[PDB]
Amino acid sequence: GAPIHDPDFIGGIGKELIVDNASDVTSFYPSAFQEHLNFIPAPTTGSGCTRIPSFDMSATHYCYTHNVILSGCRDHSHSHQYLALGVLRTTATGRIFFSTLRSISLDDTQNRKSCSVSATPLGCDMLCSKVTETEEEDYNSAVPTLMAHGRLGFDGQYHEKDLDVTTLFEDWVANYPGVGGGSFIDGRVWFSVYGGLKPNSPSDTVQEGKYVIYKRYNDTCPDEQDYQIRMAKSSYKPGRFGGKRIQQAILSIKVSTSLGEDPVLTVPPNTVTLMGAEGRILTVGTSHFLYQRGSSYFSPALLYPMTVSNKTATLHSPYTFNAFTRPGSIPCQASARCPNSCVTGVYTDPYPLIFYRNHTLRGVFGTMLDSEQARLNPASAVFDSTSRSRITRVSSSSTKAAYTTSTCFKVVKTNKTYCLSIAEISNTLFGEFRIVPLLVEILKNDG
Amino acid sequence: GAPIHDPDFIGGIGKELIVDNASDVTSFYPSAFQEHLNFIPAPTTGSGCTRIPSFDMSATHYCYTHNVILSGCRDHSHSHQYLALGVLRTTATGRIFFSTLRSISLDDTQNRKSCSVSATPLGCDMLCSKVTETEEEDYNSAVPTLMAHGRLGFDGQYHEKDLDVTTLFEDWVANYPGVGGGSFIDGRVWFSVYGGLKPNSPSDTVQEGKYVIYKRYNDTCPDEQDYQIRMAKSSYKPGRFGGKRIQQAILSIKVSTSLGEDPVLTVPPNTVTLMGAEGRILTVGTSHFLYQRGSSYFSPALLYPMTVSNKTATLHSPYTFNAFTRPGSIPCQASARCPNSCVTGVYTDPYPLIFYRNHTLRGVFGTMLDSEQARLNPASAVFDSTSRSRITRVSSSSTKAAYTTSTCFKVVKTNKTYCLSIAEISNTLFGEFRIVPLLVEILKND
Numbered sequence: 001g002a003p004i005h006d007p008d009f010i011g012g013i014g015k016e017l018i019v020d021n022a023s024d025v026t027s028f029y030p031s032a033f034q035e036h037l038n039f040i041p042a043p044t045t046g047s048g049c050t051r052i053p054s055f056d057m058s059a060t061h062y063c064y065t066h067n068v069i070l071s072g073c074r075d076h077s078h079s080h081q082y083l084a085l086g087v088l089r090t091t092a093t094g095r096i097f098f099s100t101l102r103s104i105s106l107d108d109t110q111n112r113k114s115c116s117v118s119a120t121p122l123g124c125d126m127l128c129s130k131v132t133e134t135e136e137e138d139y140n141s142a143v144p145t146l147m148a149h150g151r152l153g154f155d156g157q158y159h160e161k162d163l164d165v166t167t168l169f170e171d172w173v174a175n176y177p178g179v180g181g182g183s184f185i186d187g188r189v190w191f192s193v194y195g196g197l198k199p200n201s202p203s204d205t206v207q208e209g210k211y212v213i214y215k216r217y218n219d220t221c222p223d224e225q226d227y228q229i230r231m232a233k234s235s236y237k238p239g240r241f242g243g244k245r246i247q248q249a250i251l252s253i254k255v256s257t258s259l260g261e262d263p264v265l266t267v268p269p270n271t272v273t274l275m276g277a278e279g280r281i282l283t284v285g286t287s288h289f290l291y292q293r294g295s296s297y298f299s300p301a302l303l304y305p306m307t308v309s310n311k312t313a314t315l316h317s318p319y320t321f322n323a324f325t326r327p328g329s330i331p332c333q334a335s336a337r338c339p340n341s342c343v344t345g346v347y348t349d350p351y352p353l354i355f356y357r358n359h360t361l362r363g364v365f366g367t368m369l370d371s372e373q374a375r376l377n378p379a380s381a382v383f384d385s386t387s388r389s390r391i392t393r394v395s396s397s398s399t400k401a402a403y404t405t406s407t408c409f410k411v412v413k414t415n416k417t418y419c420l421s422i423a424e425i426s427n428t429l430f431g432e433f434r435i436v437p438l439l440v441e442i443l444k445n446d447g
Numbered sequence: 448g449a450p451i452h453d454p455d456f457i458g459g460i461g462k463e464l465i466v467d468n469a470s471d472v473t474s475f476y477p478s479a480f481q482e483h484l485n486f487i488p489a490p491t492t493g494s495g496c497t498r499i500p501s502f503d504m505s506a507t508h509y510c511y512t513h514n515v516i517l518s519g520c521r522d523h524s525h526s527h528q529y530l531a532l533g534v535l536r537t538t539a540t541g542r543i544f545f546s547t548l549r550s551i552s553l554d555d556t557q558n559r560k561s562c563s564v565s566a567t568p569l570g571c572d573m574l575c576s577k578v579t580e581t582e583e584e585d586y587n588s589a590v591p592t593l594m595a596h597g598r599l600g601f602d603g604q605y606h607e608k609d610l611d612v613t614t615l616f617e618d619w620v621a622n623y624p625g626v627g628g629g630s631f632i633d634g635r636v637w638f639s640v641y642g643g644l645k646p647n648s649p650s651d652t653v654q655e656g657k658y659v660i661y662k663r664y665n666d667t668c669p670d671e672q673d674y675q676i677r678m679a680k681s682s683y684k685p686g687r688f689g690g691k692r693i694q695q696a697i698l699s700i701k702v703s704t705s706l707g708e709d710p711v712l713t714v715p716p717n718t719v720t721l722m723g724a725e726g727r728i729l730t731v732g733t734s735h736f737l738y739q740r741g742s743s744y745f746s747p748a749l750l751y752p753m754t755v756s757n758k759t760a761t762l763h764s765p766y767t768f769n770a771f772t773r774p775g776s777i778p779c780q781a782s783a784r785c786p787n788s789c790v791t792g793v794y795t796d797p798y799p800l801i802f803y804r805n806h807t808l809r810g811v812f813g814t815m816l817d818s819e820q821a822r823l824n825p826a827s828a829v830f831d832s833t834s835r836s837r838i839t840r841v842s843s844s845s846t847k848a849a850y851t852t853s854t855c856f857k858v859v860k861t862n863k864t865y866c867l868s869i870a871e872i873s874n875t876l877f878g879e880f881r882i883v884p885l886l887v888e889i890l891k892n893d
């Protein structure tokens with residue numbers, strides 16, 4: 001007797017939404033923002049800071065979560081998490097609405113940060129880092145970061161179990177969940193995780209010399225082939241964190257009544273993965289993907305084809321979407337084209353929207369920050385490997401924003417495809433940010 | 448197996464919060480706004496209009512609802528309602544949070560407006576008006592307004608039944624729920640309702656000549672005793688709605704598995720009630736009250752002691768709170784003192800906070816719009832019949848706002864008293880209004 005989306009959605013959750021080999025990907029564009037039940041709590045005070053949204057929806061229910069800090073976004077002493085478990089439903093008039101069933105404020109003696117959620121058969125699994133020190137400090141402290149695998153059950157109850165980080169993340173100095181949603185695959189919950197490796201440790205040595213250069217489609221890097229390789233090698237040991245190696249990883253835990261059961265860490269060779277960064281494990285149809293935040297020199301949205309075997313994962317040459325850029329700081333700005341060492345960017349993910357009959361991904365939906373360096377102007381659109389469709393803006397005026405996580409689905413009864421685009425938009429009176437669940441219907445020029 | 452607030456609240460919901468005969472009412476003041484789980488949905492588009500909040504909380508669960516219009520607050524063609532049923536809970540750290548259990552968007556072929564909710568043993572009872580015409584138009588059409596008694600059950604299901612308005616509101620030209628929350632009393636759900644009476648109908652004739660003047664404490668009306676009486680008589684048949692009589696009423700329906708079972712309308716004599724307006728039926732302890740919006744000449748917050756017998760109600764000389772004023776248009780502005788004909792004001796209710804050991808009400812909490820004519824500057828405070836305590840402002844800058852509905856309770860485990868103040872505040876980017884659940888802890892000097 002577990003909760004399940006209204007019958008109108010059956011067959012429309014987590015599948016390849018648009019199969020077409022003929023049409024141009026960019027002929028599909030988002031509608032004007034749709035008005036629906038806002039399920040994401042806004043701040044209630046002049047300085048409350050709600051940030052870091054994580055979302056995932058299975059074929060049965062959805063999971064959402066965000067961090068809350070009482071005094072401001074800068075304060076690092078303590079915070080709590082908002083957690084929601086729910087199911088998609090429709091009005092008599094066929095309007096959709098995310099109907100949450102368990103709504104809670106998680107607040108105890110611990111400071112959970114960079115939290116990620118996943119919709120598993122047992123509820124809303126969550127992966128957080130319990131931190132006492134700042135990011136800069138955690139990297140310096142050679143000991144791994146404390147992590148916990150929690151879960152909001154259908155009964156509205158929350159249980160968690162700290163992970164044995166001293167053994168699991170033994171070769172790590174710092175480790176955090178990718179904030180983007182995790183995914184449930186073959187009896188296991190998969191989470192994106194990044195952090196810093198202990199220099200000269202087994203895990204660090206194997207990644208030594210390993211690098212890879214991903215380029216821009218239309219642009220070409222003028223730098224010499226030797227300079228570039230030297231730059232790529234160094235983009236993995238950037239300045240910001242004392243030249244430590246920021247590694248990308250994937251943790252899989254067995255979904256059972258025992259939290260933290262059988263955790264297994266996978267560290268993909270850097271011959272394929274760029275510098276570790278926030279991420280998300282997506283599952284669309286039978287395909288799996290790894291979104292990786294563009295924290296390094298690469299600007300275009302990345303999606304590493306992910307395939308699982310047993311308890312480990314394997315990544316492949318990523319899909320890139322040239323028009324889906326993210327603001328960054330020089331020399332890693334939106335229009336950057338050459339390899340370099342940096343740690344900037346912002347989390348704005350791409351949701352697999354349009355596929356080929358052969359099942360190879362063609363296009364994606366997402367909300368990008370349409371700006372070179374400043375986190376400004378959120379713009380929702382559909383993207384292929386090279387161009388961008390018609391867009392939908394939050395405001396024609398310059399607007400401050402941050403992270404965005406998108407997820408598309410179809411109401412089979414109305415035969416309409418929608419994309420939920422959760423975005424951190426600036427606010428007034430009540431806090432620095434208001435995380436708003438934007439909604440668009442995916443349209444096509446003709447029919 | 449119905450939902451119930453976490454054990455930390457048992458004994459702290461709907462009771463007299465502060466019993467003290469010694470202390471000055473205004474020594475109790477609200478804290479700085481507290482940060483808690485915002486359970487009220489904000490607009491998701493640049494023009495979505497969320498307005499008209501109604502809230503009520505029983506000893507077991509709470510009910511909330513608001514109207515939503517896609518294009519703007521002005522558009523009257525169609526709209527839907529957001530409905531929530533939930534229970535109060537506490538974090539490990541003792542922070543409170545309204546945890547909703549059933550969250551829904553109610554949208555069908557009908558246009559429900561001016562909706563009111565009440566927490567009954569069967570769920571969240573709702574009273575709405577299904578309208579096709581504008582307010583101005585409804586008053587002109589001699590036929591009563593269509594009403595429905597709905598309910599969001601614990602199972603997350605919504606059922607409703609249209610009321611036989613042609614018989615129930617037979618002597619009425621227009622009728623709407625008071626938007627403020629309704630209350631559950633003696634197996635019946637009680638709703639505040641106002642509207643217009645059919646001229647020369649039985650109900651209208653009895654109210655003819657009936658009036659009453661409520662005055663300001665410190666101020667005195669210069670007008671002659673004859674002019675005032677003539678003005679009071681006319682304040683009941685104001686201009687705005689074609690000189691029709693705007694009457695205040697109270698509808699009670701039996702709470703059962705059959706919606707709309709045994710509806711009974713009570714129309715109190717105007718020798719006690721002012722011109723009909725939005726309202727709320729409050730139940731605090733063993734006492735009952737009727738809040739009546741200051742739509743007429745009276746500015747101070749009103750609370751008519753309400754007593755029930757059988758299926759009808761009876762009102763008594765209202766408690767008035769002189770510092771708890773509401774912005775209005777001349778000559779019925781915040782500082783008005785003389786009887787006059789008008790239909791303005793705004794809904795900003797007072798929640799019974801501090802009582803005497805004898806049980807007579809002494810003070811109330813609420814969020815007033817601190818301004819003479821414009822709906823501006825929300826200010827939360829504690830009030831007695833004459834003064835106002837220290838306040839808590841949403842912003843030091845001039846701020847646009849509208850309705851506010853407050854409800855206080857105590858977390859017995861932490862021995863802290865809180866007041867939830869639901870207020871319509873202006874917004875940017877996403878719609879004209881954002882209905883935010885402000886929260887304050889009631890403090891005392893020392």
Ligand SMILES: *[C@H]1O[C@H](CO)[C@@H](O[C@@H]2O[C@H](CO)[C@@H](O)[C@H](O)[C@H]2NC(C)=O)[C@H](O)[C@H]1NC(C)=O
Nearest residue numbers: 467468469802803804805806807808809831832
């Ligand atoms: C309990 O005592 C209070 C005062 O402590 C009573 O309030 C007074 O009531 C009389 C009634 O004639 C008024 O004249 C006074 O103005 C009231 N005093 C104040 C300070 O308000 C109250 O009436 C008593 N309870 C009841 C039910 O009568």
Ligand SMILES: CC(=O)N[C@H]1[C@H]([C@H](O)[C@H](O)CO)OC(C(=O)O)=C[C@@H]1O
Nearest residue numbers: 113114135176277278295343346402
């Ligand atoms: C654990 C942590 O501090 N994460 C922070 C993240 C981090 O700086 C980046 O991923 C490089 O490590 O960036 C930002 C941000 O708004 O951009 C906010 C997060 O709280």
Ligand SMILES: CC(=O)N[C@H]1[C@H]([C@H](O)[C@H](O)CO)OC(C(=O)O)=C[C@@H]1O
Nearest residue numbers: 499560561582623724725790793849
């Ligand atoms: C049924 C209806 O129209 N109610 C409206 C109400 C009404 O006009 C007033 O109570 C005079 O009767 O006023 C207001 C308002 O923001 O001021 C909002 C309500 O939508």
Ligand SMILES: *[C@@H]1O[C@H](CO)[C@@H](O)[C@H](O)[C@H]1NC(C)=O
Nearest residue numbers: 021356357358359360361362
């Ligand atoms: C079809 O899929 C194959 C691999 O499965 C891929 O190489 C090809 O690009 C896809 N479609 C087209 C038109 O090439």
Ligand SMILES: *[C@@H]1O[C@H](CO)[C@@H](O)[C@H](O)[C@H]1NC(C)=O
Nearest residue numbers: 663664665666667769833834
């Ligand atoms: C009443 O108001 C007057 C004029 O504003 C003021 O001077 C006086 O102090 C008040 N009187 C009392 C008894 O409060």
Ligand SMILES: *[C@H]1O[C@H](CO)[C@@H](O)[C@H](O)[C@H]1NC(C)=O
Nearest residue numbers: 217218219322323386387388
């Ligand atoms: C390639 O890059 C240029 C900028 O040099 C850009 O203006 C152009 O749109 C891109 N080509 C296509 C087909 O989009």
Ligand SMILES: [Ca+2]
Nearest residue numbers: 138141143173
């Ligand atoms: Ca460390």
Ligand SMILES: [Ca+2]
Nearest residue numbers: 585588590620
């Ligand atoms: Ca009518």
